């Protein structure tokens, strides 16, 4: 509360560390469904159904331009990518499996780097 604070967690490396995680997600062999925004002209149903599209290139641009106020807003967009994938793709599909795999890969790196 006013003039009463928990000890200051060092957040000075968060930007660099989120960048490194994002690099590792970008280079994973199962990243291909997530590298670029879904083409809303060429994928029937996507625009209407997925209210907030998100992809790794969009996260990269947001990260590089100071549009993440803190490491949690960064995690929320990464998770959004996988939540969107699950919304639109059957579990038993190459893309559906890719999303599960990437979400797992992310959540481990997230815990190991920050928890």
Swiss-Prot record:
Residue ranges of the TM segments: none
Tissues expressed in: Expressed at varying levels in several tissues, whereas a smaller transcript was expressed specifically in testis.
Subcellular localization, as worded in the UniProt entry: Nucleus
Cystine bridges: none
Limits of the Bromo domain: 9-113
Family, similarity comment: Belongs to the WAL family.
Subunit architecture: Component of the BRF-1 ISWI chromatin remodeling complex, at least composed of SMARCA1 and BAZ2B, which regulates the spacing of histone octamers on the DNA template to facilitate access to DNA. Within the BRF-1 ISWI chromatin remodeling complex interacts with SMARCA1; the interaction is direct. Component of the BRF-5 ISWI chromatin remodeling complex, at least composed of SMARCA5/SNF2H and BAZ2B, which regulates the spacing of histone octamers on the DNA template to facilitate access to DNA.
Protein name according to UniProt: Bromodomain adjacent to zinc finger domain protein 2B
Species per Swiss-Prot/TrEMBL record: Homo sapiens (Human)
Entire protein: shown range: 2054 to 2166 of 2168
């Amino acid at each position: 509360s006013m003039s009463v604070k928990k000890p200051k967690r060092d957040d000075s490396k968060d930007l660099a560390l989120c960048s490194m995680i994002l690099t590792e997600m970008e280079t994973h062999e199962d990243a291909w469904p997530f590298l670029l925004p879904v083409n809303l002209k060429l994928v029937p149903g996507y625009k209407k159904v997925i209210k907030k599209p998100m992809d790794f290139s969009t996260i990269r641009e947001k990260l590089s331009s100071g549009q993440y106020p803190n490491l949690e807003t960064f995690a929320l967009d990464v998770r959004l990518v996988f939540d969107n994938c699950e919304t639109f793709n059957e579990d038993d599909s190459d893309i559906g499996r890719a999303g599960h795999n990437m979400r797992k890969y992310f959540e481990k790196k997230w815990t190991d780097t920050f928890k």
